[PDB]
Amino acid sequence: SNATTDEHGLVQFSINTTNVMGTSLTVRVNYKDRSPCYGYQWVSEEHEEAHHTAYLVFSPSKSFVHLEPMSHELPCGHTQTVQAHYILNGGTLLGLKK
Amino acid sequence: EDCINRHNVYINGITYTPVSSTNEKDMYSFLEDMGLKAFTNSKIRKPKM
Ligand SMILES: *[C@@H]1O[C@H](CO)[C@@H](O)[C@H](O)[C@H]1NC(C)=O
Ligand SMILES: *[C@@H]1O[C@H](CO)[C@@H](O)[C@H](O)[C@H]1NC(C)=O
């Protein structure tokens, strides 16, 4: 899902996962490597690409809460309602009222 | 032709694990060691990927 840099905003992107624990992402993704037929150590044309590898919660329950990081500015002497969004897989099997 | 080989095996549950060929008797094999041959559309042979 292509996007564009906003003047005030960066890329804020989601991707719907329906797959396995091992996942890896990147942008400027015209390739994985440029065209490594050879370099014979002469010189390599290397632009930056931000490729990321992530891994999974080993949750056999599959019920968990994701907590976005508040890695931005922070005035002290305050409180801060953390934003967290969760799931319960298979609903609750018996659960209770609370 | 029937290849049921996934990209990754999609072994949901607790863990994943790869594909592998089975070892068991078949209706195809019953008519083979019987000695004869047959034509039919129903599922006789196992779905060997
Ligand atoms: C980028 O995604 C938008 C949203 O769906 C789409 O309309 C557009 O065609 C895409 N741009 C490209 C690279 O075609
Ligand atoms: C994809 O996002 C949806 C919400 O839009 C979520 O319910 C789902 O668990 C995510 N991945 C899938 C399809 O498992």
UniProtKB/Swiss-Prot annotation, chain B:
Q: Where is it located? A: Secreted
What is the reported tissue distribution?
A: Secreted in plasma.
Q: How does it assemble?
A: Homotetramer; disulfide-linked.
Q: What does the similarity note say?
A: Belongs to the protease inhibitor I39 (alpha-2-macroglobulin) family.
Q: What is known about what this protein does? A: Is able to inhibit all four classes of proteinases by a unique 'trapping' mechanism. This protein has a peptide stretch, called the 'bait region' which contains specific cleavage sites for different proteinases. When a proteinase cleaves the bait region, a conformational change is induced in the protein which traps the proteinase. The entrapped enzyme remains active against low molecular weight substrates (activity against high molecular weight substrates is greatly reduced).
Protein's recorded name: Alpha-2-macroglobulin
Lineage of source species:
Eukaryota, Metazoa, Chordata, Craniata, Vertebrata
Gene that produces this protein: A2M
Q: Which residues of the parent chain are present?
A: 640 to 688 of 1474
